[PDB]
Structure 1
Amino acid sequence: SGAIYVGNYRVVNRHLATHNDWANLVWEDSSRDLLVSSTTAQGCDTIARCDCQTGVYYCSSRRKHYPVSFSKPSLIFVEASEYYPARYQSHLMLAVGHSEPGDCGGILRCQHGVVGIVSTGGNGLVGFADVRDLLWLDEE
């Protein structure tokens, strides 16, 4: 589990969105595994606006933050899980690292801010949904 709290937005994995998220929906995209809902309180996270390929992510199944090298956002085939059939996921970045299903939502960050959240995993890989192209997260 986990979310990004920027401005009056909450960014979560679409497959983990709650009823309150769907009832306060701003934007969602199944191909990216992302959903954004509106919040009453202002958040403290800032979004990175860069092309970094190194950063650090939080892994809840280890209680640890790990430094990683990750690929550029791309269209990658992801195997079937309990939330999606096997399909192509867009804007996804891969790295070598531990993940389990409940690690989804952990933040990946670089020197500029939040880069994305854990969305996929297995066999020593972790995939992150990028958010750096969503410029509207920085405005009302």
Structure 2
Amino acid sequence: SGAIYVGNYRVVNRHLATHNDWANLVWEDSSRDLLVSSTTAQGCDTIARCDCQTGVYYCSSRRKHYPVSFSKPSLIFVEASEYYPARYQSHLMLAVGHSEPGDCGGILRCQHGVVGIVSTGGNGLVGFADVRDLLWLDEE
């Protein structure tokens, strides 16, 4: 599990999105596994506007932050998880690391701030849903 809190906006994996998230929807995309919902109390995180391929992610199926090199956001054949079938996911940045289903929502961060959240995990690869192209989060 896990969310980003960029102001009064909560960023989560679309597949972990709660009834409250859907009842306070702002934007969602199934091909990315992203959804953003409105909050009443403000959060403590900032989004990265950059082309970094290095950072640190949180891996809940280990309780560790791991430093990683990660691939640029792309259309990636993911395969059967507990929460999706085998399929392509868009804007998925890839790194070599531990990612099980429940790791989803772990933050990937660089020197520029939050890069994205864990979305995918298979064959010793962790996949992150990029949020860097979503420029509209910082304002409004």
State the TM-score bracket (shorter-chain normalisation): over 0.9
Q: Aligned equivalents of 2:62 and 2:80: distance in 1?
A: 24
Deviation at 1:118, TM superposition (A): 0.2
Deviations 1:84-133 (A, max 9, x none): 22211000011100111110000000000000000000221100000001
Tell me the distance in 2 between the aligned counterparts of 1:131 and 1:98: 21
Identical pairs, percent: 100
Task: Please say if residues 82 and 101 of structure 2, whose CA atoms lie closer than 8 Å, have aligned partners that are also in contact.
Answer: no
Name segments (4+ residues, structure 1) moved above 6 Å: none
SS of equivalent to 1:32: coil
- In 1: Cα distance, 2:81 partner to 2:61 partner: 18
Unaligned runs of 5+ in 2: none
In 1, Cα distance between the equivalents of 2:24 and 2:123?
36
What TM-score do you get using the length of structure 2 for normalisation?
Answer: 0.98
Provide the TM-score with structure 1 as the length reference. 0.98
Partner of residue 105, structure 1: 105
Shift of 1:82: 2.7
Q: Distance in 1 between matches of 2:123 and 2:65?
A: 18
Residue in structure 1 matched with residue 133 of structure 2 by the alignment? 133
Identify the range of structure 1 (75-84 vs 108-117) with the bigger mean alpha-carbon deviation: 75-84
Give the C-alpha shift of residue 44 in structure 1: 1.1
Shift of 1:54: 0.4
